[PDB]
Structure formats: C-alpha cells, structure tokens
Symmetry: C3
Subunit: 118 residues, 3 copies
Amino acid sequence: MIIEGDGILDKRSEDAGYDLLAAKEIHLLPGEVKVIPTGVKLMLPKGYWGLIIGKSSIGSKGLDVLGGVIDEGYRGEIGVIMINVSRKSITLMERQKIAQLIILPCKHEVLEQGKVVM
Amino acid sequence: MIIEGDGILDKRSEDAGYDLLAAKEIHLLPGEVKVIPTGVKLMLPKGYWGLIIGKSSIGSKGLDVLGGVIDEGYRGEIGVIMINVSRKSITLMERQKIAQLIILPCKHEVLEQGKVVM
Amino acid sequence: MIIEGDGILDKRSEDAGYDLLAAKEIHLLPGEVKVIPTGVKLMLPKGYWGLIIGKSSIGSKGLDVLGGVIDEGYRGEIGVIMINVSRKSITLMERQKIAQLIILPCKHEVLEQGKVVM
Ligand SMILES: [Mg+2]
C-alpha cells in the first residue's frame, strides 16, 4: 500500500492493524471531541476499505474513536475522530499511537426495493 | 440485496457503506441514548452480516453508534442506537444521514474446549 | 476454534458473533470505564482477527465497547473494555452477555512511502 506521511507504522504480520500516530499534541478535556490529524495519506488497495478502530491501551483510558470508515477512494489526510468519554482530562503526545487502521474487503450490491421475506 | 423501506441509499462502488437515514426527527440532549428508526428492512446476502458504523460527519459532532451488528437472518426494522456523548444538544432531522451499513463476510467455527497454546 | 474458559458461547450459524460473558459482577457508575474479564482464552484461526463489538441489548442501555481488536496471536485472557457513557448507573451480573466476538479476515500489506495519487 502506497502511503505518504509520517503517522502510520508498518505492522507485524500477526497483527490486524497499522498503528496511527498523532501529528501534534492534543488535549482533550472530559466531553471534548477533536479530529486528530495523523499527517498520513494513503492509497487503499482496490477492493478494500479501511476501518479506524481503537487501540486497547487508549480505549482503557476512556477515549473512543468515532466514525471509522476510510473509503477506498479517499486520498486526503487521515484524521482520527477522538472523544474523551471519561471524566479525566487526557493529553495525547505528538507521535503517540492513537488508533489502528485495519484493511477489510468491500462488498458492492445493488439495492432492490421489494418485499423482505422470512 | 432486497430492501423494504425509505431509509437506505444506494452507494457508489467506491464507497464501503450504504447511508442510513433517520425516519423521524430525533432530539438528543447530552448523555441521551435513543434507538433511531430507519424505516428499513432488508435481506442480507447469505454468508454476510451488516456492520452499522458512524458517518464521519456525525461522529465529528460527538454522536456515537452503539451496538452495530445486523445478523444475516435479521428481518425486522433496522434501528441505529445513537448516543450524544458530547456536551451539546443535537437535533437529527427527518431523513438526515445518521450512519452507514457495511456488508462483511461471516465466519462460522465450532468452539472446542481445550488448551490454548503459544 | 480452540477456546479455554467459561465466558464464550457457541453461536448459531445465522449469527455473526459469539456472545462474551462477564466473569464477575461489574458496577459501572456514569463515566466509568472498566476492563471486564471474560475468563476466556482462545486461538484465533490463522488468517483472521477478532472484533469485539457491542450487543444491541447492552448498547441500548448506553454502555459502549472501547478498543475491540484481538490480534491473531493474542493468547491471554480476553477483557472487554466497557464504558458507561449513559447518565444512569448500571450493574452487569456475573455471566451476563456483555459483547460479541466476530471473526474477520486479516490483510497484510507492506507500506511503501511514495506519492498518493488520484
Ligand atoms: Mg464507541
């Protein structure tokens, strides 16, 4: 996969996802939602999309990833939508691992308006 | 895919998911969780399940999708469980795009009670 | 799939995921995040990872699953990171169904630093 940028790491073959990094320091008070820039652009492989999902180490602090879908044709900078749903302030440091990207297959079906059975 | 109902849109082939729409206007104060009706029933293709996941435009407002799994055999009306985890009230308008549905493959394995290695 | 432990249930072939159970009673005040033990270890099938995602019955109460990725090589006890993002206290009972595990395919790609097109 072609990438451009400094915020995504090669993964081990036994891991599902690539680490995504914060491109700058981010402060999140309780309740705050911010789009965290990663500095990364990429060319997803044809036939696939990208799921941005939490790291367990980050989720255990009460930070959540909102949204999560990178469409095959998305070519701009990846932002991770992060919310502090905990009741303690958190600071994410520049270059800290904040989420992971997992590549999954796409399925395209026509929608047919009819009668749902069963 | 056979659908019945007015709250799901055809997608571009370069997009992962189908937009899901609110079937009525929904108000969410901070902290409120509601099951938002979409008015949609569908027949998932055999061998697949449906992931309901957030839209980036909605997640950036601090709304989250809870749950997310539509099982292949589910034939009733799709509801999107939405929570306002932000600290500002939000109104979702009738027919607004509130989430997306992505079709993913199913894997069925027997569970065997034994000794986990490695 | 080889499992070791008392907190994961066989699934119907028409369901996407396996139920995960709380290994002990858990109290969550509003805003609290806890790693809920399941008592389960497993050997994911090679070529796959495990997505821990919410049950609709649990998500409708305003509990969310944070994180969610079990990597193919993970052999320790599965913990479900659960947060009460609602404004009502909740108690999860011992052996209650708290989340589901869905097995999904892995995709491994090399990252190539270059110029993103299109
Ligand atoms: Mg969430």
